[PDB]
């Protein structure tokens, strides 16, 4: 690669590895939130799942939560 | 859960959500330096492993490489 | 390597790659399964999470099923 | 759900589960044989890449470790 290439691809490099930092100072303060949760009572992995299904489409979630329910009382599940 | 508690709560996913957002921005900004990878005619995949590789334990890594070498010979892999 | 290691490594080798071929076997036969009850008029998303869950602890899905109520209703969700 | 789509319901999870149960055995074996590996002196984490590579094209593998050591020297890797 000539030195042009070269200097595009350190220039790259540095810039992903920059913004991992980022990310990865952002996944230390999340960790921090949720330890500050727990501090105070709360269920970190409960919380997690809220976090994660607020993300979902609300309705195609209780659509297959309903479609759910009904496949299991079918195969007579108590 | 009593009013200290709902606040506690609401805090809490408000807080990992508003970091849930900038880590997105940041998930963004690493796939537009891609894009100007991608742009300027380098191979992203390979980009990608140079940036995997370059966190891990480097002699870790060569040590295990060179085992994996031993062991493809020693299966007679041509 | 000598040769009595060579002659067990490739003994390691083919007795995995042969389990694998019968893993992939059986990936397959689930996977037909599912295109017979697509094609019966089911939802396969909604049947795979019936065998996912029926493999979890049945009580400590519902304790955390009860205690994410909980929470979405202690922050307003409606 | 009627008496048909609930017979047939059962049908499948219990022939999705009767597979799952074979595909567990067939895990285990595979445990097995690298328990006897690492018994004989060999290196699990090795043998396993062993036959993860040997499962992916080896021309696009050797092509993108090239270019790979490429990128790596002209970052100026040492």
Redesign the interface.
């Given at each position: 690669?000539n030195s042009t290439?070269?200097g595009?691809?350190?220039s790259?490099?540095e810039?992903?590895?920059r913004?991992?930092v980022?990310?990865a100072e952002?996944?230390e303060?999340?960790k921090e939130?949720?330890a500050?949760?727990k501090g105070?009572?709360?269920?970190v992995?409960?919380?997690k799942?809220?976090?994660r299904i607020?993300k979902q489409d609300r309705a195609k979630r209780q659509e297959?939560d309903a479609?759910?329910d009904?496949?299991?009382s079918?195969?007579?599940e108590i």
């Amino acid at each position: 690669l000539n030195s042009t290439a070269q200097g595009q691809l350190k220039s790259i490099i540095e810039r992903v590895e920059r913004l991992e930092v980022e990310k990865a100072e952002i996944m230390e303060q999340i960790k921090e939130v949720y330890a500050e949760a727990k501090g105070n009572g709360f269920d970190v992995k409960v919380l997690k799942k809220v976090v994660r299904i607020r993300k979902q489409d609300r309705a195609k979630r209780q659509e297959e939560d309903a479609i759910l329910d009904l496949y299991l009382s079918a195969i007579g599940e108590i």
